[PDB]
Curated annotation (Swiss-Prot):
Residues of the full protein shown: 733 to 887 of 1817
Active-site residue numbers: A145 (nucleophile)
Residues the UniProt record annotates as site (Cleavage): F144, A145
Organism field: Homo sapiens (Human)
Protein name per Swiss-Prot or TrEMBL: Nuclear pore complex protein Nup98
Annotated phenotype, changing K72A: No effect on autoprocessing. Severe loss of autoprocessing
Peptidase S59 domain sequence ranges: 6-144
Length: 151
C-alpha cells in the first residue's frame, strides 16, 4: 500500500525491504526514515514514522533547489513533521559564462552559503550547512511548508 514509482526516488529502509518490516497488523513503522531523489535531494525523519498506506508519489516532490511535501495532516502527523532536508546540486550560475560554479574557493568568495542560510531563515527553517563538494544545502524544518531557492 506504500506507493513510490517515480524514477530516481528511493527510501531508507529501501522500498524492497518495507514488506518485510511491515508487522502482523499491517503497519509499516520504521525507526528513522529517508526519502530522496538521486541527485536532487532527500528528507530525513528521525524517530518512528508510520509509512502505512502512504502514497509517497503524491506526497513528496523533490526537484532542483526545491522541495514540497503535500501539494495535509496536522503538524506531527504523516510527513508533515520535524525533518532534515537536503537539496543537492545547489550551485549558482556564472553571470558571464552562464555555466555552473562548482569551485569551492569561488563559492566561498561569493559567500554562496550565506545566501542559502538567509533563504532558510526567511522560510522559517534552521540552516545546518552547505557542502560545496556536492552543492548540498541542509536545513531542518518543523513542518511543510515549501522550501528552496527561487533564482
Amino acid at each position: 500500500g506504500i506507493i513510490l514509482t517515480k524514477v530516481g526516488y528511493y527510501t531508507i529502509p529501501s522500498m524492497d525491504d518495507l514488506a518485510k518490516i511491515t508487522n502482523e497488523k499491517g503497519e509499516c513503522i520504521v525507526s528513522d526514515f529517508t526519502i530522496g531523489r538521486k541527485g536532487y535531494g532527500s528528507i530525513y525523519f528521525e524517530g518512528d514514522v508510520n509509512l502505512t498506506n502512504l502514497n509517497l508519489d503524491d506526497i513528496v516532490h523533490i526537484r532542483r533547489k526545491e522541495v514540497v511535501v503535500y501539494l495535509k495532516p496536522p503538524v506531527g502527523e504523516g510527513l508533515n513533521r520535524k525533518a532534515e532536508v537536503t537539496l543537492d546540486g545547489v550551485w549558482p550560475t556564472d553571470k558571464t559564462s552562464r555555466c555552473l560554479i562548482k569551485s569551492p574557493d569561488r563559492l566561498a568568495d561569493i559567500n554562496y552559503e550565506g545566501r542559502l542560510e538567509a533563504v532558510s531563515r526567511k522560510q522559517g527553517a534552521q540552516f545546518k550547512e552547505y557542502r560545496p563538494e556536492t552543492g548540498s544545502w541542509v536545513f531542518k524544518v518543523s513542518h511543510f511548508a515549501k522550501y528552496g531557492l527561487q533564482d
